[PDB]
Design a protein around this ligand. Structure first.
Ligand code: 4MB
Length: 167
């Protein structure tokens, strides 16, 4: 038994809810929240900017130090940093950005990072401003992630479409 409430069970291990992932992170304080990162960890908008704003920019300050030391992530890759006031840890995962021409086949690699964590609160990778089809992102998630993943979908319209079209 864990602290996640109001989710709808899609599979043995994947759960989904209509909620802002930022708001969800503040209530639950999960062990791991996933950020929809880019390779530079520049958290300007979307999930990353909303998460970063909720940390009062501390996520960005930590991220800038991480990049100064390590250089950019890979598309499909991740790093574990602090969860600040939102979670114990933030898993920054880089899905391919379709609006930059990145290989959608990298979405599976991106979701494989989730398997290193027993339980996660996450958004749909490569959805929103990253330009991928969220229906596709949910299919890759279900077919790739084996650990317990609690997906937050902010758009109520999209949430209902994801559920009603789920195979
Ligand atoms: C409402 S918020 O901007 O504070 N935080 C969010 C939540 C979800 C998304 C998304 O694209 O799914 C983007 C930002």
């Amino acid at each position: 038994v864990n602290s996640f409430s109001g989710y709808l069970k899609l599979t043995d291990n994947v759960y989904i809810k209509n909620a802002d992932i930022v708001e969800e992170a503040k209530k639950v304080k999960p062990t791991v929240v996933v950020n929809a990162a880019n390779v530079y960890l520049k958290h300007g908008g979307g999930v990353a900017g909303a998460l970063n704003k909720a940390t009062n920019n501390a996520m960005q300050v930590e991220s800038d130090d991480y990049i100064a030391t390590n250089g950019p992530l890979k598309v499909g890759g991740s790093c574990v940093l602090s969860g600040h006031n939102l979670a114990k840890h933030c898993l920054h995962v880089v899905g391919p950005n379709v609006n930059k021409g990145e290989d959608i086949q990298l979405l599976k690699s991106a979701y494989e990072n989730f398997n290193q964590h027993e339980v996660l609160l996450a958004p749909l990778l490569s959805a929103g401003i990253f330009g991928a089809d969220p229906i596709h992102s949910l299919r890759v998630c279900v077919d790739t992630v084996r650990t317990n993943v609690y997906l937050a979908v902010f758009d109520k319209n999209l949430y209902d479409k994801l559920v009603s079209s789920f195979l």
